[PDB]
């Protein structure tokens, strides 16, 4: 027990550290190297930002939550942290979605779309992602206690209240994960099937890496959210922790499946680390 806590804080802490370091490297490498400053990498920039926010704030506060056994910081910063976390995670997923769309359009109309698409459009789509994430999650999180008339959240624990009622739970969860993953998988299927063998094996390779990443990371919690919404004593806390962390690590593996999956990005990376 004396070495266990430090082991936990070391694993989780170092994980978060690797997250923020990696994404900082992405942003920095995109700003520093003009050659990779394409419109397709602006989405990677926004993604790196969201994953940075997740990497610094969500991971450490949830590490604290889990390592102490309860949430001491208070109801105000509880609602704040949860709002932030959900909004920026949803932002991350919407970013992945918008990347999927962009890649689809770049694939289908290979000569018209890349020229027709401008940076202003990219900024517009990014802003759309963040805004829609905020609207979908933030107002429902903080103002649920004001509407219900009580804060269902226990004094020691810090979860979201509206999951106590399934009607909103499903509606938000599918709009955050299920619908977006359906769209991503189907249009990526369009990409793979219509685009393309070295040229063709690789497409299925990258698409598979990306989709398997997104799924193995985001699916556990989203289905755990659906399980707990039916019965209260049904889900313990250890598996919950596992699910939450599994959701967090996506923001750690994002530079691998989008940035470092390309050849130049890593070569750029090396010089920053190699001074």
């Amino acid at each position, epitope marked *: 027990k004396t070495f266990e806590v430090v082991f936990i804080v070391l694993v989780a802490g170092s994980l978060s550290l690797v997250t923020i370091i990696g994404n900082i490297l992405v942003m920095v490498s995109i700003k520093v190297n003009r*050659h990779l400053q394409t419109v*397709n990498n602006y989405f990677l920039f926004s993604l790196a930002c969201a994953d940075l926010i997740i990497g610094v704030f969500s991971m450490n506060l949830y590490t604290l939550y889990t390592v102490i056994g309860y949430w001491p910081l208070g109801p105000v910063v509880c609602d704040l942290w949860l709002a932030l976390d959900y909004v920026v995670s949803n932002a991350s997923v919407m970013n992945l979605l918008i990347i999927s769309f962009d890649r689809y359009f*770049c694939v289908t109309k*290979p000569l018209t779309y890349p*020229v027709k698409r401008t940076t202003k459009m990219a900024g517009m789509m990014i802003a759309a992602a963040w805004v829609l994430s905020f609207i979908l999650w933030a107002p429902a999180i903080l103002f649920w206690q004001f509407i219900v008339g009580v804060r269902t959240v226990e004094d020691g624990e810090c979860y979201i209240q509206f999951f106590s009622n399934a009607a909103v739970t499903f509606g938000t969860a599918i709009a955050a994960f299920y619908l977006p993953v359906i769209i991503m998988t189907v249009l990526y299927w369009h990409i793979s099937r219509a685009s*393309k063998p070295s040229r063709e094996k690789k497409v299925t390779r990258t698409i598979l890496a990306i989709l398997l990443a997104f799924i193995i990371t985001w699916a556990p919690y989203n289905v755990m959210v659906l399980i707990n919404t039916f019965c209260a004593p049904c889900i313990p806390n250890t598996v919950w922790t596992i699910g939450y962390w599994l959701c967090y690590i996506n923001s750690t593996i994002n530079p691998a499946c989008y940035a470092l999956c390309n050849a*130049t990005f890593k070569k750029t990376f090396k010089h920053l680390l190699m001074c």
Partner: nanobody
Amino acid sequence: QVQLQESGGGLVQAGDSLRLSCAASGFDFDNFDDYAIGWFRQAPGQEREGVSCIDPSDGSTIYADSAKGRFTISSDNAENTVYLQMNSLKPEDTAVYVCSAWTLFHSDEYWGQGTQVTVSS
């Protein structure tokens, strides 16, 4: 990184033909195979529209609706150099022709210097 230089730029009367060649320099790690290459013409004050594009690894040709039937594109995989031959040209095809290369999903995208092609009559 890599510079892409073009050739063949010159004068031609209506009905004649030309052969623009785009050569790409030596690249580190990335294989010429891993790059798809397209030709883009830029007319005075006009938007940089795409004429055609070729995937050397697959040999797949994708032409624009404007230059279909006249323009033919290929390459030499061993030489790492692409050739775009245009036939039966019009004075509407007076523009600066540049050579672009995009890695899949539009990372590592490159643009060249460009050569002038002016059609008389």
